Each structure stands twice: as structure tokens, then as C-alpha cells.
């Protein structure tokens, strides 16, 4: 049952009339078609978030009207025999003025990038609106003309260069649109088939956000088929822009980039610190292009920030299953400590580490912090051997169980060879007591 609704019914009755770009505004459109991007399959990524935007303005516009809602999609279709490749969608028009004006925008003209020579069709959706063609093969020369037999929407047939002709097989482009557009907002079709599935739920209010809903998208971005021990959903504004959700895999030993439910980077380590590469899921920002590492940095502080302080909530809340975590990923925690170059970097990490103490029974854990909150009136004692006991009847301990104060017990080399790295936790020096 295909559903396809693109075919030729656009005439131009008259002659079309020729205008020019700026000399400045052609150095820039040249750019979008060879300096801007990295990857030439874009171009259809671009198209798709036009006709994404285009479909909610002009909905949100009906909504807000009070009118019922028509066929709102998007269509391609390819065609090899001509070597050609369309987009249209029943989204908001265009008008002669933003025909020529406009040139949103800087996406349309990526498509230069593959195209020889583009043909487009627009009619806004204003009641006794008029449909206009608009032509152009790459220079700074494009023609506009009235059209009719256009329908409400946007239409861009693009003809593909020579080297380009891939573009022009479903095969291909299906490749493409599953890569960068699984999660668009409206649904999208292919030569007539459907394509789109995927809900983009890092979009939606948190609290609205279902748990098997969670599972889906975890088990897509993750490729995994367990469930996820932990779920961070964080929407921002302040900072920066940030619709993101966070996930802590359930197993014991890849986030993706994406803006406005735009893929960018399906790899992106370098949004989150090497020590939390542990994380799965997705980060969606306007606030980002366009390898890269510019204003990254930015967020990655920010996000470093919210998940450690994140991992603090949850120990708080459940310091039983936080210990089973801090057992399964406390390696990642340790090496983050270790690595990191600024000392109040350390002492943040640092505030998720976990250890016995002599104050408290075997078994149960204290943070760093609760302990300082127990001490009296100057220094962090701690204590590494192979167990409780151990430790316990030790002479050392004794000495300093004796007199004053609490000490803290760890019975891993690599666990007391962190405390010796971080040298100092907040305004207390850390000491072992075999000194
Ligand atoms: N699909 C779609 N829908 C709408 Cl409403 C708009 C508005 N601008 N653009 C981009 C664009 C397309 C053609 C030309 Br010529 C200039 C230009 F900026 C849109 N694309």
C-alpha cells in the first residue's frame, strides 16, 4: 500500500525574471556548497529539517486557529533514470518575498553541494496565496516565476552533478534518511514507503516520559537488550540548550550527538569526560555545529557536573544499589580522579567514591564527606588492608581508634593508591596511618 504524493502539476504560464546575488552573498552561498560541510549527504539531512520546521509552524499556526489539520508529511522520491532526487512537505509555504529575500535558509542552499541545476515550487499556506517556481544552476543567477498547480507547501526537485548520481538510488538514500532523520517529527516516506518510527522522548517533559519508553530508546541507542540501572533525563536553558537523556547500562564491562532530532555525531566521546565514556544515550543542542572541539568543552563541563551530581542524589536515595554501582563502575571513577589535571575536578569525582569506616558497622559504605561531617574540631585517617578484620585488630588502628578518631578502610592496592593521588579532599589532607 504505497502512499506517495508527489507528481508533476506545476506549470509556468509566463516568463520568469532573472535576478542576481549580492557579491558577498555569493562567496557565502560557494561556501555552503563546498567549505561548510564535511560530508555531501547532508544535503538531505538539511532538506528534512526544513520541511521538519516548515510542518510545525504551520500547525502550530492551525492549532492556535482553532482549524482541523491536513496531510501534514514529507516525501522523496529518487529517480534514476532522470538522476534526480525531490523533496516536498505540506508544511507553512513560502511567499514571493521570502522566494527572493530569504538566501533557515543556509540548509536549503547545502543542496548545491550535489546539484547541478535545482528546480523548486512553493505556496504558502496564507488563504489566496499564489504558487511561484524558483530556478537556479549553481551560480549567483536564479529566476522566479508564478506557478500554478502548486500545492500548499514546498517542493525542491534537485538534479544531481555527475558524481554524484548516487544519490538518485532508494538504496542509497534510504541508507541516509535512516541515518540522520529516524527520529523527525513528522512522518517522513520514501518513494511511498514509510521510514520513520522512532519518538525522540529526550524532547518530551520528563515527568511525562514512560519507563518501557526509556527501554525502547535505551536498547536503540545502546544496541543493547538489558535494561538501564539508571536514567537521567536533563532539559536546560540556561547554560546552554541541552535535551538529553543519560543511561547507566545494567551489565558490567557510546552517546550520540544530536540537534533539534538531528543527528550530528553517532560517536561523541568528547561531549562527556573520558571516565563517564561508561554512559550511554543521546545529548540534542541548537547550541552546536555545524572534527570538532570549540565550545564542546563547555558542555562537557556542564553535563560533568549534573551527572556527578546526579550519582550523588542516588546514593542519598538508595545507598544499597549506589554500592552495587560504585562496586561495578568505581573503576572508571578512580581513573577519572587520577587523570584529572585541576585538584577541585578530583574532589568532585571524588565525591562518589565509597568506603567502610571504623565508626560504622561492615557492610555499610560513607562518602568522604560524610565522614568530615563527623569530624571533630584536622586530617583524613585511612587504613589499606586485605579485609575488615584485618584491619580491625590491626596495631595501627588501635593507635588511632584508641584516642579520637574515625578511619576509613579500603582493602584494594588501586583503592589506596587513589587516596595517595588525590593528596587532599576539600580542607582536609588524606593520611594513611602507617606513618
Ligand atoms: N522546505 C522549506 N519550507 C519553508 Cl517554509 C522554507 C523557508 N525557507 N526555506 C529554505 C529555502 C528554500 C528555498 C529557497 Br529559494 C530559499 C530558502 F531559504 C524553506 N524550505
Known amino acids: 500500500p504505497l502512499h506517495s504524493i508527489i507528481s508533476s502539476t506545476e506549470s509556468v504560464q509566463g516568463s520568469t ?12 552561498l560557494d561556501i555552503v556548497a ?26 502550530h499556526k492551525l492549532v492556535s486557529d482553532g482549524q482541523a489539520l491536513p496531510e501534514m508529511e514529507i516525501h522523496l522520491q529518487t529517480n534514476a533514470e532522470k538522476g ?27 543542496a548545491f553541494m550535489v546539484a ?41 526537485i534537485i538534479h544531481l552533478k555527475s558524481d554524484c548520481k548516487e544519490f538518485s538510488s532508494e538504496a542509497r538514500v534510504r541508507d541516509v534518511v535512516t541515518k ?15 521510514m520513520n518510527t522512532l519518538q525522540a522522548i529526550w524532547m518530551m517533559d520528563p515527568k511525562d516520559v514512560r519507563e518501557w519508553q526509556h527501554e525502547e530508546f535505551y536498547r536503540y541507542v545502546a544496541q543493547a537488550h538489558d535494561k538501564p540501572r539508571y536514567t537521567l533525563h536533563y532539559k536546560t536553558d540556561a547554560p546552554l540548550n541541552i535535551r538529553s537523556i543519560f543511561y547507566v547500562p545494567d551489565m558490567k564491562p557510546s552517546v550520540a550527538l544530536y540537534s533539534r532530532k538531528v543527528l550530528i555525531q553517532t560517536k561523541a566521546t568528547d561531549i562527556l569526560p573520558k571516565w563517564l565514556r561508561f554512559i550511554r544515550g543521546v545529548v540534542d543542542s541548537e547550541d552546536i555545529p555545524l572534527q570538532e572541539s570549540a565550545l564542546i568543552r563547555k558542555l562537557r563541563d556542564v553535563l560533568q557536573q ?11 536515595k538508595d545507598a544499597e544499589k549506589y554500592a552495587k554501582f560504585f562496586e561495578d563502575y568505581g573503576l572508571f571513577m578512580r581513573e577519572g580522579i587520577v587523570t584529572a589535571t585541576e585538584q577541585e575536578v578530583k574532589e568532585d569525582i571524588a565525591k562518589l567514591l565509597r568506603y567502610e569506616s571504623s565508626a560504622l558497622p561492615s557492610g555499610q559504605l560513607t ?65 594513611s596511618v602507617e606513618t
Not at 44 to 52: C, G, H, V
Not at 181 to 190: A, D, E, G
Request: net charge positive.
Open 116 to 156: 547541478d541545476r535545482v528546480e523548486v515550487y512553493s505556496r504558502s499556506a496564507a488563504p489566496g496565496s499564489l504558487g511561484y517556481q524558483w530556478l537556479s544552476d549553481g551560480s549567483g543567477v536564479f529566476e522566479i516565476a508564478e506557478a500554478s498547480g502548486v500545492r500548499t507547501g514546498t517542493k525542491i
Open 306 to 316: 549534573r551527572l556527578i551530581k546526579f550519582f550523588i542524589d542516588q546514593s542519598k
Open 84 to 110: 534526480t532526487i525531490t523533496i516536498q512537505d505540506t508544511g507553512i509555504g513560502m511567499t514571493q518575498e521570502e522566494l527572493v529575500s530569504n538566501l533557515f535558509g543556509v540548509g536549503f542552499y547545502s
Open 367 to 431: 562518602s568522604l564527606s560524610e565522614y568530615a561531617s563527623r569530624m571533630r574540631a584536622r586530617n583524613i585517617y585511612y587504613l589499606c588492608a586485605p579485609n575488615r578484620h584485618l584491619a580491625e585488630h590491626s596495631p595501627y588502628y588501635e593507635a588511632m581508634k584508641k584516642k579520637d578518631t574515625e578511619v576509613l578502610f579500603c582493602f584494594e592496592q588501586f583503592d589506596e593508591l587513589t587516596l595517595l593521588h588525590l593528596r587532599e579532599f576539600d580542607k582536609k589532607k588524606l593520611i
Open 17 to 28: 525574471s532573472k535576478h542576481e546575488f549580492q557579491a558577498e552573498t555569493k562567496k557565502l
Open 34 to 59: 563546498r567549505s561548510l560541510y564535511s560530508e555531501k549527504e547532508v544535503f538531505i539531512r538539511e532538506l528534512i529539517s526544513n520541511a521538519s520546521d516548515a510542518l510545525e509552524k504551520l500547525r
Open 180 to 194: 540522520y532523520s529516524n527520529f523527525v517529527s513528522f512522518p517522513l516516506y520514501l518513494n511511498g514507503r514509510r
